[PDB]
């Protein structure tokens, strides 16, 4: 998921660096339940 870009014209002005910055370690339990009121 890329970072929040600035004004795209300012991004073009800044260049490739402001483009560059954007882009089983720990177990976990999980769930989901889908219900209709």
């Amino acid at each position: 998921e890329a970072r929040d870009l600035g004004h795209p014209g300012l991004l073009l002005a800044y260049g490739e660096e402001a483009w560059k910055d954007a882009a089983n370690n720990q177990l976990y339990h999980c769930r989901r339940d889908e219900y209709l009121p």
Partner: peptide, 19 residues
């Protein structure tokens, strides 16, 4: 949310007694 594991529940993440 319902703490009980009712028929409403869809996943169920548990261990086997083997484990």
């Amino acid at each position: 949310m319902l703490p009980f594991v009712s028929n409403r529940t869809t996943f169920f993440t548990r261990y086997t007694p083997d484990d």
